[PDB]
Design a protein around this ligand. Structure first.
Ligand SMILES: O=C(O)/C=C/c1ccc(NC(=O)C2(NC(=O)c3ccc4c(C5CCCCC5)c5n(c4c3)CC(=O)Nc3ccccc3-5)CCCC2)cc1
Ligand SMILES: NC(=O)COc1ccc2c(c1)S(=O)(=O)N=C(c1c(O)c3cc(F)ccc3n(CCC3CC3)c1=O)N2
Length: 551
């Protein structure tokens, strides 16, 4: 079947930013008939996944619990209420949500409407390879439906992926735990070989059968009968496909592939990619495979069979993925150093802590983080990518010297150190106070994140070259700026002083011997790094448990 069919009605509007103007170019790329051929490897892997899914017991979320996960600025309903009404449990919001639920239980077939829009994302104007990337397409149902999806499937999509894929499920790891997993897998092999597999437009490649196979896995859970019916109806009426409406309310077309903005997108894509890849590893005869899967992002570490043999096994893996309707974007290439593999737009690098001991950490090319940060300093944005980058990339040279210095100087100038900001981590929205960053960083990366040094030449050069290319002052300027930022933070005391002392410890000549922040243990990070919710419309406000008077 065709991934999409179009009426011709335009996908209407809401360093460069992707707009609604480039939507036509994206539509051409993602529109095609899918040819899927399944085999015994696929069937064997599915049965193994199902046996693991069978250990899961999932609970039905109440209307109140589902309402509480809704982001404050989530798209309003076309039925007379918005995200504020949902979070307040308003009479109108709650009555409509209950009617949507009742309809899911009563109607098992009518396709549910969705809205289609072009994603506005900032990329760097780099005239080195081709040109500007076309806008990605976002497909999502109405607010009432999104609350119902949480009631039925929030517990499933939060628990089932780890139960099925075990250590291969990537969203259970913080960046440091992801690094630890990759390093351990690499060291376990006699002669390691690793590769990333890029699927061309993964959402478009997902077939009706893929979605039903994904539902057959959900159905292995112990579920409340209404949750079981809701999952069955949501599968047929929403997940499998349905009509597309643009922002103007015009019939835009029809979808028969994965919608980006439903609660099951991340879980479903991860399960689908894992199933196809594990089956393709068997068809390719790759020895002792370790897979790490995050949605459509796949990395495989295995036992090398020699240079020519590895190139041949990779082409066999690709042919098998292609049959399963997961063809490649960039062709996969075997890598023989862990540091050279790019997965989840990141690579492993090594540094030393204050005692000269090796510390592996996760980094990336800083061009896109710096460009996006520049866009965000220039104009007000709902989500602050700089904040998420400081959190996830806290041990890196560039996040510490440039992002921390620049944004802390802006917060000091605006007196907004205590103002909570939104950032996206694994598709979920978190409301975080920048004053909590030293405690968050210690919890996720450890005390060593504040004293790393002896960065690799390759890492230092990538950073320095990127600054030159973007017209950013050199690293020596950032050291001078950080010394002043640090001094002003120290003067303020409390959490602000901890920001100065811990985040800017690298900027001082003498360098302090840092002790653990006592209040860090109080942070409730239980919802962090459990699952991916990309396009799932999930929100959390960072909270503190058992606070001590003197902290
Ligand atoms: O050789 C030496 O010894 C010293 C050299 C030297 C060179 C340049 C400066 N620049 C500055 O003082 C100014 N800009 C900056 O001090 C500046 C700060 C951050 C900048 C950023 C990002 C960095 C990441 C956080 C957000 C801001 C970008 N650009 C920046 C410029 C350059 C810029 O203009 N825009 C972009 C565009 C895309 C990406 C990055 C940038 C402020 C007043 C005059 C211009 C200072 C010293
Ligand atoms: N195709 C589908 O359906 C979704 O497929 C997906 C594939 C990968 C991801 C997602 C969806 S996500 O939207 O859930 N977010 C991330 C992600 C982040 O949130 C993230 C946030 C930051 F501020 C900084 C770095 C981040 N990094 C890199 C560092 C990390 C440790 C690995 C991610 O990868 N990964």
């Amino acid at each position: 079947s065709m991934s999409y069919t179009w009426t011709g009605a335009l996908i209407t509007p809401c360093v460069y930013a992707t707009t609604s103007r480039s939507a036509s170019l994206r539509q051409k790329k993602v529109t095609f008939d899918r040819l899927q051929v399944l085999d015994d490897h696929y069937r064997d892997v599915l049965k193994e996944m199902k046996a693991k899914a069978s250990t899961v017991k999932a609970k039905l979320l109440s209307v109140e619990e589902a309402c509480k996960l809704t982001p404050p600025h989530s798209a309003r309903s076309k039925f007379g209420y918005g995200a504020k009404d949902v979070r307040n449990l308003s009479s109108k919001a709650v009555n409509h949500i209950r009617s949507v639920w009742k309809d899911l239980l009563e109607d098992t077939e009518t396709p549910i409407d969705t809205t289609i829009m072009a994603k506005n994302e900032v990329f760097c104007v780099q005239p080195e390879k081709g040109g500007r990337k076309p806008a990605r397409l976002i497909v999502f149902p109405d607010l009432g439906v999104r609350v119902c999806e949480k009631m039925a499937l929030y517990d499933v999509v939060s628990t089932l992926p780890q139960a099925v894929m075990g250590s291969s499920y990537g969203f259970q790891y913080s960046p440091g735990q992801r690094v630890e997993f990759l390093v351990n897998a690499w060291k376990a092999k006699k002669c390691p070989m690793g590769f990333a597999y890029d699927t061309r437009c993964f959402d478009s490649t997902v077939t009706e059968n893929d979605i039903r196979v994904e539902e057959s896995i959900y159905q292995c859970c112990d579920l409340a009968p209404e949750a079981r019916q809701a999952i069955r109806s949501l599968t047929e009426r929403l997940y499998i496909g349905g009509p597309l409406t643009n922002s103007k309310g015009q019939n835009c077309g029809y979808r028969r592939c994965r919608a980006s903005g439903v609660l099951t997108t991340s879980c479903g894509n991860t399960l689908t990619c894992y199933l196809k890849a594990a089956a393709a590893c068997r068809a390719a005869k790759l020895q002792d495979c370790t897979m790490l899967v995050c949605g459509d992002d796949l990395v495989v570490i295995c036992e090398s069979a020699g240079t020519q043999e590895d190139e041949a096994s990779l082409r066999a893996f690709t042919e098998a993925m292609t049959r399963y309707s997961a063809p490649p974007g960039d062709p996969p290439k075997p890598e023989y150093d862990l540091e050279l593999i790019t997965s989840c737009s990141s690579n492993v690098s090594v540094a030393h802590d204050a005692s000269g001991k090796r510390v592996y950490y996760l980094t990336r090319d800083p061009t896109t983080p710096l460009a996006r940060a520049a866009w965000e300093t220039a104009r007000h944005t709902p989500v602050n990518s700089w904040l998420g980058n400081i959190i996830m990339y806290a041990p890196t040279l560039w996040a510490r010297m440039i992002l921390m210095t620049h944004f802390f100087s802006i917060l000091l100038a605006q007196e907004q150190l205590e103002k909570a900001l939104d950032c996206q981590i694994y598709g979920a929205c978190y409301s975080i106070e920048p004053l909590d960053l030293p405690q968050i960083i210690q919890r996720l990366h450890g005390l060593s994140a504040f004293s790393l040094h002896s960065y690799s030449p390759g890492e230092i050069n990538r950073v320095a070259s990127c600054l030159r290319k973007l017209g950013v002052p050199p690293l020596r300027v950032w050291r001078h700026r950080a010394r002043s930022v640090r001094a002003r933070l120290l003067s303020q005391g409390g959490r602000a002083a901890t920001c100065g002392k811990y985040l800017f410890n690298w900027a001082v000549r003498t360098k302090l011997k840092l002790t653990p922040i006592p209040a860090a243990s109080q942070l409730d990070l239980s919802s962090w790094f459990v699952a991916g919710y990309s396009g799932g419309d999930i929100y959390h406000s960072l909270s503190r448990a058992r606070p001590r008077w003197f902290m």
